[PDB]
Design a protein around this ligand. Structure first.
Ligand code: IHP
Lengths: 782, 189
C-alpha cells in the first residue's frame, strides 16, 4: 500500500498551495504525476496551481482532464475544483463542486460560507439561506454569521426570522460590546429597526412599536441621520405631523443644504399648496440659514406674484453675478425649464438692467460674468446671435477664462459646427493645461467632430501610458465610459462617412483608393461595435465586483448598505451609459442582420501586402483596447463578421437589460425593432400596444410602428402569428419622429422613399441646425 | 440650484465619472464600492436639482446624471483608517478624494461637503483626527483647508502624484447666533 506514500505527498502539495507557494506545490505534484499520472487529486490541484501562476490554458487542460477522468471524487478534489471555478468566474459550476465536496463526505463546514457567497452572487438566495443557516449553526461565535443569516432571511421575506436572529445576538452580547465593535452594533440595531419598519407597514400599533424600539437604540445608534429620517417618517405614517415637523427641523439644522428636508417639512406643516404660508416659512428659515439655497430658492418655484417673484429672483441672481459665480444661470436653469414663460422675461429684464449699471473698468468681475449669464440665457432660448454677442463681449474684456471658451464652443455646437467648437475648446485648453476638466471637454468635442486621433492625443496627456503609445488602454482599464461611448459613436459616424465616399466611387488610382476606403469602413464598423461592447464588459464587471461583499459587508457590519448594493446590482443594466451603448449598438446589429438577409503581380503584390500589413500593425498598436495577450481582435473583425447578429446583441446587450428594466422605463420602440427581426411578431403587437397605453394613439411614432406592423400582417411569415397579429387589430381599428421611423422601413413597407424624404426635410425647419444637419447627413442619405 | 446630501451606492458610478473628468487619480468601481459599503455614512455628494414648480422629466443618457433632472457636480469620498498596523492607533479618517466641477466654484460646495464629512467622522466613527493630500500648486485648496477649515500642513510629500508633483499632507483634530430652537412654532404674525 504505497498509496499512502503518494497521498501524503499530495497533502504536502496542498499545504504548499495553501501557503501561497505554488511553484513548490507543482514540483511535488509533477512528481506524483509521473508514477501515477491518473491521480485526480493532483491533477486538480495542479490545474489550480497552474492558474495561480498564470498558466491559464494549461490549468484548464488539467482541470478538464481531471474532470473527464472523474465522470465521483474525493472531498478535497471537489473542494479544489470549486475554487478553480470560483477563480474563473464559473459560479454555478463552483457551486456544483463545492456541493459535491459535502456530498462525498467533507467535514469542512467552512464550505458553507463559500456556497453562501456564490449562491448570493448568482441570485439564488433561497439556497444561500440554507448555507447561511448551516454555517451559522457550526459557528455561533462570530457575529458576521448572525448578520449574514438575518440578511438571507430578510431577502427571502422572512422578516420576523431576520428580526429574531438579530435580537438573539443582542441578548447574548449584552454587556460584551467592546468599543471596537460599537459600530457594527450600531449598524445592526438600525438594520433590525429597518426590518421592523418594513413589516410594520401602515399598522398604527406596529408603527408605534418601531418608534419605541428607535428610542430604545438611539444612544447606541451613531447613524443619527438615518435614525432621524426613520423617526420623521414613522411620525408621518402615524399622522403625528407636528412631531414629524420637529424631526425635519432637526434634520434641516444638521444639513440646511438638503432640499429634501425642506420639501418634506412643508407637508408636515400642511402648508404645501399654500404659497402665502410657504413664503412665510422660508422667510423665517432664511434667517436661520442665510447662506443656504433652499430658503432663498424654493420660493422661486411657487411665488405667483410677478412683483415679489421679480424681487426674489434679483436677490438670488445678482449677488451671484457680483461674486463672479459661473454657475449662476445653471442654478436657475430648472426654473427656465419648469416656469419658462413666467421666469425668463423677469430674469432677462433683471439681468439686462443690472448690466446697464455696470462699468467695465470699475466692475470687471460682475461685468464679464453678467455677459456670461446672458449668453447662456439667449442660448437656452435658442437665440444664437445674441448668445454669440454676449459671450463675445465677455471674451473681449477678459479672454483668460476657460469658461468663456466652453460656452462659445457650446453655442457653435448648437449651430451644428462641431469642428469649430472643438477648435475653440482647444484654444481654451491652453489656458489651463494642467486641468483635466477642460481637457475632457476638448476630447469630447473632437470626438463629436469625428477627429479621433486628436481626441486620443489630447486625452493621453492625462492617462497613465506605460507600455503603450496612447491612453486608450488605460481608459478601458479605468472604466471610462464617457470616453469609450463617445468614441464609439464617432467611429460609427466615420464608418458612415467613409461608406459614402466608398459609394461615391464610380485609372488604377480609383482602384487603390477603393481598397483603402474598404479597409477604413471595415475598421470603423469594427471599432464602433467593439467600443460599444466595452460598456457591457464594464458593467458585467460591476456585477462581479459584488462577490467579495457577500462576506465583507457581514464582517464589517454594514447589512443596510449591503442590501442597497444588491438593489444597485439588479439595476446595473438599466443605467444611462449602458442603455446608451445598447441602443446605439442596435443600429449596427440590426443593420448587419438586414444586410445578411438582403445581400502578374506576385512580387509587387508581396511588397504591397507587407506595406498594408505593416501599417495595420502600426494602427493596431494605436487602437488596441486590451493587453495583447487578452485580445487578438483589435479592430473588431470577428464582431462584424458574425453570422448571429441578433443573437450577439441579445447575448451581449439586450438580454441583461430586458430582464432588469422596469416597465415604466422600457423602450418599446426598441423591443418592437428587436422582435421584428427575431421573428416574434407577437411581441411586436405587445410592444406597440404597451407603448400606445403610455403615450396615446395620437403619437406619430405610434402610427409609424402601426403602419410597419400592418404591412407585417400580410403576407408574412407563418400564417398563425400573422392571423393572431391581424386579429389583434380589434383593439385599434410635423411629427418628424414619426416620418423618420417610417423611413427606417422604407424597404419593408411599400411607400415612396423619395416622397417621404421630402416630407422629413420639410419638418426640419423648426429643429435647431445641430439636430437639423444630423438627420440630413446621417439619417436620410443614399 | 445645488443640493447637498449623504451618498449612497447609487452615486458611485457618477462619482467615478466626476473623478475621471476632474482628476488624473482614478480608481476602479470596486474601490468606490469598498468605500460606500464600508463607511456608508461618511461620504457626501453635491448634485443639481429640479424641483416641481406650480406651473427634465426623464433621465438624459449622460454620464453625470444620477436621476431625472439631477446631475452630480461634486463629491467627497471618505474613509476611516483601516490599516491593521494602526488598528491599535486612535480612530482617524482620510479624505480619499474631493472633487467639484470648476464651473461650480465660488459657491462653497467643497466646504459644505467637507463640513458634513468632518462631522460624519466625528459623530459616526468618533474620529480623533482626519487627513488628506493636495497638490502644492493648489492654492485654492490650501486656502480652503487651512484658512477656512483649520487643517494644518503636516508634511510635504515629494513626488506624490503621478506627474511628479509634490503634495501637501494636511491633518486636523476633531455662541449667541440665531438658530431654530426646535420647539416653538415657525409660523406667526
Ligand atoms: O449634452 P451635451 O451635448 O454633452 O451638452 C451638455 C448639455 O448642454 P446642451 O445640451 O444644452 O448643449 C448639458 O445640458 P443638460 O442636457 O444637462 O441640461 C450641459 O449641462 P448644463 O446645461 O447644466 O450646463 C453641458 O454643459 P456643461 O458641461 O458646460 O455644464 C453640455 O455640455 P457641453 O458644454 O460640453 O456641450
Amino acid at each position: 500500500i504505497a498509496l499512502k506514500k503518494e497521498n501524503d505527498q499530495f497533502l504536502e502539495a496542498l499545504k504548499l498551495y495553501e501557503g501561497k507557494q505554488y511553484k513548490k506545490s507543482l514540483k511535488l505534484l509533477d512528481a506524483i504525476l509521473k508514477k501515477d499520472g491518473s491521480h485526480v487529486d493532483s491533477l486538480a490541484l495542479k490545474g489550480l496551481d497552474l492558474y495561480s501562476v498564470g498558466e491559464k490554458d494549461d490549468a484548464a487542460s488539467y482541470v478538464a482532464n481531471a474532470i473527464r477522468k472523474i465522470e465521483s471524487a474525493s472531498p478535497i478534489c471537489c473542494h479544489v475544483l470549486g475554487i478553480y471555478m470560483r477563480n474563473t468566474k464559473e459560479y454555478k459550476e463552483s457551486i456544483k463542486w463545492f456541493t459535491a465536496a459535502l456530498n462525498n463526505g467533507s467535514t469542512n463546514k467552512q464550505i458553507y460560507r463559500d456556497l453562501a457567497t456564490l449562491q448570493s452572487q448568482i441570485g439564488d438566495f433561497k439556497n444561500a439561506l440554507v448555507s447561511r443557516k448551516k454555517y451559522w449553526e457550526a459557528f455561533l461565535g462570530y457575529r458576521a454569521n448572525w448578520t449574514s443569516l438575518a440578511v438571507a432571511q430578510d431577502v427571502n421575506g422572512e422578516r420576523q426570522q431576520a428580526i429574531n436572529t438579530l435580537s438573539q445576538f443582542e441578548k447574548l452580547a449584552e454587556g460584551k460590546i467592546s468599543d471596537s465593535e460599537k459600530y457594527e452594533h450600531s449598524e445592526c440595531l438600525m438594520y433590525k429597526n429597518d426590518i421592523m419598519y418594513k413589516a410594520a407597514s401602515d399598522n398604527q400599533d406596529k408603527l408605534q412599536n418601531v418608534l419605541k424600539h428607535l428610542n430604545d437604540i438611539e444612544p447606541c445608534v451613531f447613524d443619527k441621520f438615518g435614525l432621524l429620517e426613520r423617526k420623521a417618517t414613522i411620525y408621518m405614517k402615524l399622522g403625528q405631523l407636528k412631531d414629524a415637523s420637529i424631526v425635519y427641523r432637526t434634520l434641516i439644522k444638521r444639513n440646511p443644504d438638503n432640499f429634501k428636508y425642506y420639501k418634506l417639512l412643508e407637508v408636515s406643516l400642511g402648508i404645501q399648496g399654500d404659497n402665502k404660508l410657504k413664503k412665510a416659512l422660508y422667510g423665517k428659515l432664511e434667517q436661520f440659514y442665510p447662506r443656504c439655497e433652499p430658503p432663498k430658492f424654493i420660493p422661486l418655484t411657487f411665488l405667483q406674484d410677478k412683483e415679489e417673484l421679480s424681487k426674489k429672483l434679483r436677490e438670488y441672481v445678482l449677488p451671484q453675478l457680483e461674486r463672479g459665480v459661473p454657475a449662476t444661470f445653471s442654478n436657475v436653469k430648472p426654473l427656465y425649464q419648469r416656469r419658462k414663460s413666467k421666469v425668463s422675461p423677469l430674469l432677462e429684464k433683471i439681468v439686462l438692467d443690472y448690466l446697464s449699471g455696470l462699468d467695465p473698468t470699475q466692475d470687471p468681475i460682475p461685468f464679464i460674468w453678467t455677459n456670461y449669464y446672458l449668453s447662456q440665457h439667449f442660448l437656452f432660448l435658442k437665440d444664437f446671435p445674441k448668445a454669440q454677442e454676449y459671450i463675445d463681449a465677455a471674451l473681449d474684456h477678459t479672454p483668460t477664462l476657460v469658461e468663456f471658451y466652453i460656452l462659445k464652443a457650446r453655442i457653435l455646437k448648437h449651430l451644428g459646427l462641431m469642428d469649430t467648437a472643438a477648435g475653440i475648446l482647444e484654444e481654451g485648453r491652453q489656458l489651463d493645461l494642467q486641468d483635466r476638466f477642460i481637457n475632457c471637454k476638448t476630447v469630447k468635442y473632437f470626438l463629436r467632430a469625428n477627429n479621433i486621433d486628436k481626441a486620443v492625443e489630447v486625452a493621453s496627456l492625462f492617462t497613465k501610458n506605460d507600455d503603450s503609445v496612447n491612453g486608450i488602454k488605460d481608459l478601458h482599464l479605468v472604466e471610462a465610459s464617457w470616453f469609450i461611448v463617445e468614441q464609439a459613436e464617432a467611429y460609427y459616424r466615420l464608418y458612415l462617412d467613409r461608406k459614402k465616399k466608398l459609394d461615391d466611387l464610380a485609372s488604377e488610382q480609383i482602384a487603390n483608393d477603393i481598397k483603402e476606403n474598404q479597409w477604413l469602413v471595415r475598421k470603423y464598423k469594427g471599432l464602433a461595435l467593439k467600443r460599444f461592447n466595452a460598456i457591457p464588459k464594464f458593467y458585467k464587471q460591476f456585477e462581479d465586483d459584488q462577490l467579495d461583499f457577500h462576506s465583507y459587508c457581514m464582517r464589517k457590519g454594514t447589512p443596510r448598505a449591503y442590501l442597497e448594493m444588491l438593489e444597485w446590482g439588479k439595476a446595473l443594466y438599466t443605467k444611462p451609459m449602458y442603455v446608451r451603448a445598447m441602443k446605439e449598438a442596435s443600429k449596427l446589429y440590426f443593420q448587419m442582420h438586414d444586410d445578411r438577409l438582403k445581400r502578374s503581380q506576385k512580387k509587387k503584390a508581396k511588397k504591397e501586402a507587407a506595406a498594408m500589413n505593416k501599417r495595420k500593425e502600426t494602427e493596431a498598436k494605436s487602437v488596441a483596447a486590451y493587453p495583447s495577450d487578452q485580445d487578438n481582435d483589435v479592430f473588431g473583425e470577428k464582431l462584424i463578421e458574425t453570422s448571429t447578429p441578433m443573437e450577439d446583441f441579445a447575448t451581449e446587450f439586450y438580454n441583461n437589460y430586458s430582464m432588469q428594466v422596469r416597465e415604466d422605463e422600457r423602450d418599446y420602440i426598441l423591443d418592437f425593432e428587436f422582435n421584428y427581426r427575431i421573428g416574434k411578431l407577437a411581441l411586436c403587437f405587445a410592444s406597440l400596444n404597451k407603448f400606445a397605453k403610455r403615450f396615446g394613439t395620437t403619437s406619430g411614432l405610434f402610427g409609424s410602428m402601426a403602419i410597419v406592423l400592418l404591412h407585417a400582417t400580410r403576407n408574412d411569415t407563418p400564417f398563425d402569428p400573422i392571423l393572431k397579429k391581424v386579429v389583434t387589430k380589434s383593439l385599434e381599428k410635423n411629427d418628424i419622429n414619426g416620418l423618420l421611423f417610417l423611413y427606417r422601413y422604407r424597404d419593408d413597407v411599400p411607400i415612396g422613399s423619395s416622397n417621404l424624404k421630402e416630407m422629413i426635410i420639410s419638418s426640419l425647419s423648426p429643429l435647431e441646425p445641430h439636430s437639423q444637419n444630423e438627420i440630413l447627413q446621417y439619417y436620410l442619405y443614399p | 440650484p445645488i443640493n447637498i446630501r449623504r451618498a449612497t451606492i447609487n452615486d458611485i458610478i457618477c462619482m467615478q465619472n466626476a473623478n475621471l473628468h476632474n482628476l488624473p487619480e482614478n480608481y476602479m468601481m470596486k474601490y468606490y464600492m469598498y468605500h460606500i459599503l464600508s463607511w456608508p455614512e461618511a461620504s457626501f455628494v453635491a448634485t443639481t436639482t429640479t424641483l416641481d414648480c406650480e406651473d427634465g422629466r426623464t433621465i438624459k443618457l449622460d454620464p453625470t446624471y444620477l436621476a431625472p433632472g439631477e446631475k452630480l457636480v461634486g463629491y467627497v469620498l471618505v474613509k476611516m483608517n483601516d490599516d491593521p498596523d494602526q488598528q491599535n492607533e486612535p480612530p482617524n479618517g482620510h479624505i480619499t478624494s474631493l472633487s467639484v466641477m470648476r464651473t461650480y466654484r465660488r459657491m462653497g460646495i467643497a466646504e459644505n461637503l467637507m463640513r458634513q464629512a468632518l462631522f460624519a467622522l466625528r459623530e459616526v466613527h468618533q474620529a480623533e483626527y482626519v487627513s488628506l493630500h493636495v497638490r502644492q500648486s493648489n492654492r485654492a485648496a490650501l486656502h480652503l483647508y487651512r484658512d477656512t477649515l483649520a487643517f494644518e500642513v503636516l508634511s510635504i510629500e515629494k513626488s506624490y502624484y503621478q506627474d511628479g508633483e509634490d503634495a501637501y499632507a494636511m491633518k486636523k483634530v476633531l455662541e449667541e447666533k440665531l438658530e431654530d430652537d426646535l420647539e416653538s412654532d415657525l409660523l406667526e404674525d
